Amino acid sequence: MWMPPRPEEVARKLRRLGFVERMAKGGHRLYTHPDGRIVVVPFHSGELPKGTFKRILRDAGLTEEEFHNL
Ligand SMILES: [Cl-]
Numbered sequence: 001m002w003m004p005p006r007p008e009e010v011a012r013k014l015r016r017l018g019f020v021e022r023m024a025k026g027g028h029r030l031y032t033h034p035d036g037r038i039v040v041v042p043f044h045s046g047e048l049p050k051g052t053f054k055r056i057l058r059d060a061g062l063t064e065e066e067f068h069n070l
Helices: 007-017 050-060 064-069
Strands: 020-025 028-032 038-042
Touching: 007 020, 007 028, 007 038, 007 050, 038 050, 050 064
Parallel strands: none
Antiparallel strands: 020 028, 028 038
């Protein structure tokens, strides 16, 4: 089963990989990693739509596995 992740849990996992928050405005935050990945995450809702979660994984350069273990 598809379990919609919470945006703040996604942000904690990104931060554990070395992404750092560079903008916070309008209920969104933009995170960059030293290797140049750039990821925007919406926080206005408590859970992310599937497509937004899959956009975040794409832009973060992650698989589901790596994601869940952080
Ligand atoms: Cl980990």
